[PDB]
């Protein structure tokens, strides 16, 4: 009933496995639609081929900067930035998908996948989905991070799209 998207993750070019997400379009339709379209590539740009640039074990894996590959870039399907839709959903545990930002109302394309409860981000980052399948892949990704977030190998979204 909500949409599902997938990422096929690779590590230094070698496939690791698929992560699928449920997007809570029933609660955050504008934010879900952004991520869904960036995953299908239907606006002529998006997540395919981009990297996870900041992975902090025990916290989260951050990605989605498909324009500058370092945190400084990214763009939404609506323009460079869009508003915080709402903060209905909370950072309740591992597998939550939420927007990265540069302060209030600055959503673009960068996102994070939590590997722990991150409740101090409630009311500041818009939660819009959750890992459905492949949490083991996300845990595998964590192994390549570090305390400052720099990754020890290149972690890429080799392919992505919509399942259901």
């Amino acid at each position: 009933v909500n949409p599902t998207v997938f990422f096929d993750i690779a590590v230094d070019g070698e496939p690791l496995g698929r992560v699928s997400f449920e997007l809570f379009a029933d609660k955050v339709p504008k934010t879900a639609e952004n991520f869904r379209a960036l995953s299908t590539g239907e606006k002529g740009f998006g997540y395919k081929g981009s990297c996870f640039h900041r992975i902090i074990p025990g916290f989260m894996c951050q990605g989605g900067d498909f324009t500058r590959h370092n945190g400084t870039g990214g763009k939404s399907i609506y323009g460079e930035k869009f508003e915080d839709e709402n903060f209905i959903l909370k950072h309740t545990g591992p597998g939550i998908l939420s927007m990265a930002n540069a302060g209030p109302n600055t959503n673009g394309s960068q996102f994070f996948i939590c590997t722990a409860k991150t409740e101090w981000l409630d009311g500041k980052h818009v939660v819009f989905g959750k890992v459905k399948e492949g949490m083991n892949i996300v845990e595998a990704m964590e192994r390549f991070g570090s305390r400052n977030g720099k990754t020890s190998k290149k972690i890429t979204i080799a392919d992505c799209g919509q399942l259901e």
Partner: peptide, 11 residues
């Protein structure tokens, strides 16, 4: 965060 990354646990 996306731009100035600060200390503690932010995105």
């Amino acid at each position: 965060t996306a731009x100035x990354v600060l200390a503690x646990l932010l995105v």
